[PDB]
């Protein structure tokens, strides 16, 4: 759309008995495709490891 890519996301995560939606009813996110996001993993707290 001009110089802005458009993507439609309809995801489903199921909790309790029924499945829900990721995004709210009708929202829109203005963001960059080169954004920086960090995947951080903590320390395990069990004896065996």
């Amino acid at each position: 759309y001009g110089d802005v890519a458009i993507v439609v996301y309809s995801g489903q995560y199921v909790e309790n008995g029924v499945k829900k939606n990721f995004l709210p009813d009708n929202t829109m996110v203005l963001g960059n495709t080169q954004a920086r996001g960090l995947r951080t993993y903590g320390c395990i707290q069990d004896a065996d490891a």
Binding site: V14, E15, N16, K19
Partner: protein, 48 residues
Amino acid sequence: SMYTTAQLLAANEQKFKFDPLFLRLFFRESYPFTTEKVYLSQIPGLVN
């Protein structure tokens, strides 16, 4: 003891339209079974 004449020119056969699309498109595999009953099974795939 009749003297009149007759002639047959054309004799059509009218037929009704019939085309199996639901059976042709979807039901493609046939499995004849020699037993008394058939088991069909499903398993859910939802996770908390």
